[PDB]
Design a protein around this nucleic acid. Structure first.
Lengths: 102, 75, 102
RNA sequence: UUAGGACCCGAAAGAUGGUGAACUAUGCCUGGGCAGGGCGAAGCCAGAGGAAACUCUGGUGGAGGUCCGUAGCGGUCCUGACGUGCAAAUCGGUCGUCCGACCUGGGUAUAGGGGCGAAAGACUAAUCGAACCAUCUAGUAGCUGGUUCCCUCCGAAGUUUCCCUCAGGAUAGCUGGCGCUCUCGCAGACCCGACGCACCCCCGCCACGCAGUUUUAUCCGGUAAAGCGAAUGAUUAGAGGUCUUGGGGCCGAAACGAUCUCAACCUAUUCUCAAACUUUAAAUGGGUAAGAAGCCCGGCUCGCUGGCGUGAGCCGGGCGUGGAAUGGAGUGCCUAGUGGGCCACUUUUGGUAAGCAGAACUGGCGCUGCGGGAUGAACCGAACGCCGGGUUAAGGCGCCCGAUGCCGACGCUCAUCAGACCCCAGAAAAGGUGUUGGUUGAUAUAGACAGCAGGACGGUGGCCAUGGAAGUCGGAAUCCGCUAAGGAGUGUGUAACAACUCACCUGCCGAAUCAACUAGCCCUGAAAAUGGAUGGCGCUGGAGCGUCGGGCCCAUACCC
RNA sequence: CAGAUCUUGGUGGUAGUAGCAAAUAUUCAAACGAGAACUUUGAAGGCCGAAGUGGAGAAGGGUUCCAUGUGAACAGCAGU
RNA sequence: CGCGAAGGCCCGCGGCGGGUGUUGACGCGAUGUGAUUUCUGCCCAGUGCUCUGAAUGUCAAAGUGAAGAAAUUCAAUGAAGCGCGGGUAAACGGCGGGAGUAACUAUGACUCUCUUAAGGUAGCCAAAUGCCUCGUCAUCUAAUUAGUGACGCGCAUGAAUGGAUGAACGAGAUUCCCACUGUCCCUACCUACUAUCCAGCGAAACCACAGCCAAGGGAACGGGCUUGGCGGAAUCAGCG
RNA sequence: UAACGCAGGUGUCCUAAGGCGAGCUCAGGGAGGACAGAAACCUCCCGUGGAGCAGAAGGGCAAAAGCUCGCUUGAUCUUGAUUUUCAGUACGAAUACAGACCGUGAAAGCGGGGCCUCACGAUCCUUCUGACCUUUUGGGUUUUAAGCAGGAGGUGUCAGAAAAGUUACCACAGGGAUAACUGGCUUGUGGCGGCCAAGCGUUCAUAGCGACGUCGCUUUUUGAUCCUUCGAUGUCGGCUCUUCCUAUCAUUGUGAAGCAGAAUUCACCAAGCGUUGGAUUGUUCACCCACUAAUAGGGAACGUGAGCUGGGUUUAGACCGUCGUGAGACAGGUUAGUUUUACCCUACUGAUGAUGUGUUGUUGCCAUGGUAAUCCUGCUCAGUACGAGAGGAACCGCAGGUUCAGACAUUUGGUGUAUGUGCUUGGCUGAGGAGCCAAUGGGGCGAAGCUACCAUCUGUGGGAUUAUGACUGAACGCCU
RNA sequence: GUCUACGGCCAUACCACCCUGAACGCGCCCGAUCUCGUCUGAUCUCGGAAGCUAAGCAGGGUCGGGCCUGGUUAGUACUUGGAUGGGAGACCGCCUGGGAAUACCGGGUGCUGUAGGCUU
């Protein structure tokens, strides 16, 4: 169903990463962590823009798929198609559990 | 039938309401567990000071008097 | 099932951020300051909570920083390799690196 | 603990021995009763018809577990009346059968694990899925209820292990009583401690001992943190180097000779992680040792130990208390209650969460009142004999209510939903030239931002798209001159639009102007069910919010 | 003794309240009498309407039968 | 289905005891189904019942032999019942699943196949039995989860644990039409006995104390407590 | 140091996989060699565990604890002590010792099972083994039995009973430590509303919607929980009745369009006022026919059983299907099935009376509480504005209606026991006449009275402002 | 200065290389009668001294990999104890005290006990 991200927003369990003891984990909805002109040498782009968190929270890998597209979808219209370079500095590792109780 | 499980948190008050935490350290702790081969001997060394009057302390008696005579000259 | 035994089975995957962690990062030319600063706030809306946005002092994605970087590249302590720059320390047998290349 | 009930009262049941068929169930003997009408079976007579079989028509006849229906017997519907009634099952209307398997009196039979049953577990003296009466009997019950005078002193548990154990017990634990062995001021008029004191101080003398503490010395671990160009695992992105490779191929030996070209690899780098990964690795924490149970010499003993050493144990002799702070320690019995727990700061597992379930440490509530939180287990202060005086903590000081009736200090805010105090019963992502501060970049006498002074200019519907586009779906394209001044074009609606119109600035007037971020308060975001709650009334130079002063109020606390 | 839906005995509020409504119906005069809606006589109006609100019996009751008298008590008001 | 009486079924504490039986197979006793009409399919593997038995596998009191000093140890011999073998379903009961195939596509005569002791035959229905289900089609209605009539792939229909049907009958269960009406639209009015008031006579349930509310907290729904709104003697008929 | 937390394993396996000693070194990789290949066998090199040690995982280990050889049975007999299981009780397992007899090794040493952590069992009873064993009841011999010590036969609910169902015919002790209703806390799920803005809306992100993401609210959905009641709160729906809410279907006032007019869609102040008649089903729900301005959603212990109904759940009787061998069960179908009490207090609607002005009476004022009116059609405006056209309204008037409210009896209808007057059946006073009885005999017509959307009349004026539109006008020389 | 035999600590002792050797002190080595084990006298065992430092070994070197000890990272992270501290909440500031680790940058590359030689 919906399972809105209000439920899994705080960080209230010990890390439970995808390993041999946790099978059946799906694949995260984000797969391409780098996009733009990736071959650009370090001489090229000296203005590194950051986004920094401010709450010790959890970000769903659902969001990272749409945050990557949303910021990419703008830059393409602004700079060009090989004028920038984007890297998601966060990886979804900590699988989160669900229970169907009807 | 269904019921609640335990909890354990007055374990420290009852603990120290009374209760001295030492085993009464003591001189002459009992010889319980020593090597029997070793212990047999120390039962013999005792046995040949507790037996008789002429053999052992006749040597003790002489040496003591020298301890008696030697020390007095200093005073 | 009546909650007689409720350990969840996995779904979805989440990533955690600490206060000060860096979520997303963008490289660009120095003339595209504004294109970065507002594309990120466009991305900021697909994330729970609030994230600060600022432009880094660090040249590109390198470990090294603002405009002292061009000296070392000239001084021959860094060399550009793809998306990054190698640090050339002096503990390595530079008498077998200078002998190789001054 | 056994019993005589065995604290008192309490079961559903079990056994022995007897009384009932006057209700009812059924068989039998012997007696009583059943208006009035319909339908019209056999059998009989006559008439007609036919060869006969026998067929038609009209009568007579009075059969039936037959029909309408009264007594009698029963009990369908109104789910009618009464429902502390007329009645512990009746009454009114409406109903079924009424010559038969019919209804009824009396006499006799069958009796409880038995009778009897056209069979519903029905009936057996208003009681039946085994009656009634007396006795075993005061039957057992980890299970409810109740337990009778005052004061004083002490005062818990809801946890361990085992149990056909989960509402109970045994066992540790916690609690009380009775003491006992010593120190000890119950120490004198002779002047103590390389050990403690009262006091000449202890001829007798445990000053030795011990702690929910720290100091000093030495051990111990693997949590937080951190790390992965450190092992295992997970994982992204480029660079460079040539082996099997391909896919596209070229030659036709053959092209990883070369060269394009991706690629599995290797090399150094890089992005991000781990409760069941870890090189490092804290805070807090766990034992020990802190002297007489010692320091030190001389001698003796051996059936073990062997260079001649021995390790242990015995005798004898000199030095006694040896880090800080606190008051006395040690020890033996008998033991009732408890073994349903709960809450909070923190640490923390399952869960979306829960006034949910489950754990560690500490403190609370139960067992506990008192001041404050308007009200309340558990929050803040504080622990209770009966009182007077004084001062306080937490709270507060418009009035309810003891206290600001200080001419209290600096500020912020208009709410047609203001705000008003730990736990707490006061909602968010997002917005606001409402308002008050801050940060950053600019521009202003080579003089500002306005407004007056001209406007989206023309080659030009450029070239094209043809998709219609003179600013528009959409196009590699997308300039010139003016350089005050206008993008081969930005918001409105469209037949291609006309049209509204989205900029730069000439001269004057002449000192502050622009933009973006940013936090404080206020506002929007903000929907629910009796009338409705910062505690109420009310409050706006505050009785609202922030940072703070003097003074003042009283608890069973502190002082006399 | 305060309790045990405690045992026995007693008394309240409820309360002068619910209630004295099944089957048509009584009225006038007179008598004894202290007293009369109710007893008795007379007059009238009604019903039970011969499967009876009639005349006799069996079970069962056991003196209720009949007469004289009484005004404690009972006859859910009263009463000769 | 049992039974020819030194018997079947049965009572009984016990006897040359008693009931059926003052009976005798056109009878007594034990069952199942339920008038008539028309039919009563396949399975004896399972669970029972019964029938026989030499060469008998197991088999207990006696009884017989062997060794021992004896108690005893051993062996052979060995009835009924079991084990072995027949019958019986109007005895309890039970009665399949896959593919492929005809001239458009859907269906399947047919063929292949695995598997039981048989594979549900005659009939019948979304029925008192059909979860999906308010099945699909038609009828009656303007509108019908209901009734009816067909269809059958029927979770889970079916032959005496009877199937199907059918004139008469039923205080049995359902649907519709004609007539009728206060059931209703929409309530009104009339009568009798009460209710009501008076004289007389007069009970019982019940009762911690008592009885106005809103919000708060609380054992998480207060009549009492906190903050408020407020409050007047004594009462009569009603009311839920 | 806990939960029906997590990822797993055991009831076994070994005469060697135990005990020694010796000699080697593994996994993996590279380069070379007849067949020979990526994958046999031969050689060299690199090789800190990357292999193996029975199995679960952790720990441990390279001249071993791994591999291969040679010999053996320390897996033997007997005392005690100690550790792990929070009773410092057992079993089990294990560690140091000691007394014996041995194994291997020249040797020092090691070894009384497996490299460590699990692989297991009381009393009673039976069975085997042991000594010149004890007893066998007045003495003796023998057979037999009883003893003492040590193993085995097993209780897996594993500190250890010998044990099948149903009860809807049920019973008793109790339980809110314990379920079915509300009432609580949460909000997954259900419902509703925002933010961002890729697009859809031929043109264009935002007239109307809005994916990828994210934030909340509500308790009218089902859940999760067990706090209150099991010495009883009567548990589904429908009928009747009141009030309340807004998240508004229609009505009054308004904003916007891709809005010409008509119809419409999004929104604001807004709960005053309305939101229907019916077939089927027990229905809440659903689906339909019809009218209408619309046929909006809800709450009050899932309102409302001393208000009713009892249709369906849900007792006892029954039949069918399925299951069970059987009693019986179904969270499948059908049928028949007792609904109790008000007079108490309170509230509520009515009705006497109360304190005070000396006592009475008349005529009136308003402090307060209640509140009430709502909706539509037709004519005209007008076939006009608007539109190519098809189509097509409003404001002011005129006339009437639906819903509701208050009355009234002139008319119409109903009532009727003025028991009024006739007709009339059966019986009864001898008959005529006049009458009576039949619970009001029956039936005509009916005064007064009470009554009906079934007849009749009447139903209203201002003030303050909200939404929105504006005037003047700064902050900010313009502009609002 | 150093070696040999037996060792303690067990990498500052290792590993890759390159350079030089202080009596055969250790080794390389020449053979297989005997002791002894092999497919092989390569290993193991046994008998010697013709040569040899080339190799082992030792000493040194590498702006070496490693390794030990320091420094910055940092008084950052983390945390014992307190509050009627902020925040709806995630969390955060403060007082009291304790207090780390990579990146990066330097320094170091065996000490030694007993017995026995060598002055090459």
């Amino acid at each position: 169903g919906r399972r809105p991200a209000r439920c899994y927003r705080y960080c209230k369990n010990k890390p439970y990463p995808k390993s041999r003891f946790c099978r059946g984990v799906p694949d995260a909805k984000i797969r391409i962590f780098d996009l733009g002109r990736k071959k650009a040498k370090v001489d090229e782009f000296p203005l590194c823009g950051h986004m920094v968190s401010d709450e010790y929270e959890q970000l769903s890998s659902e969001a990272l798929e749409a945050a990557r597209i949303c910021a990419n979808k703008y830059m393409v219209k602004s700079c060009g198609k090989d004028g920038f370079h984007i890297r998601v500095r966060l990886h979804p590792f900590h699988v989160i559990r669900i229970n169907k109780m009807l | 039938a269904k019921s609640k499980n335990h909890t354990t948190h007055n374990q420290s008050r009852k603990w120290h309401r009374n209760g001295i935490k030492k085993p009464r350290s003591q001189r002459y702790e009992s010889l319980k567990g020593v090597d029997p081969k070793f212990l047999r001997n120390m039962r013999f060394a005792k046995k040949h000071n507790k037996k008789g009057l002429k053999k052992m302390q006749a040597n003790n008696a002489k040496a003591m008097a020298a301890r008696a005579e030697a020390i007095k000259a200093l005073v | 099932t009546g909650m007689r035994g409720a350990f969840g089975k996995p779904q979805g995957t989440v990533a955690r951020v600490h206060i000060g962690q860096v979520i997303m990062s963008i490289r660009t030319k120095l003339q595209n300051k504004e294109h970065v600063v507002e594309a990120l706030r466009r991305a900021k809306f697909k994330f729970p909570g609030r994230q600060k946005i600022h432009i880094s002092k660090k040249w590109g994605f390198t470990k090294f920083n603002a405009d002292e970087f061009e000296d070392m590249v000239a001084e021959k302590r860094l060399i550009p390799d793809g998306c990054g720059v190698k640090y050339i320390p002096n503990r390595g047998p530079l008498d077998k690196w200078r002998a190789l290349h001054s």
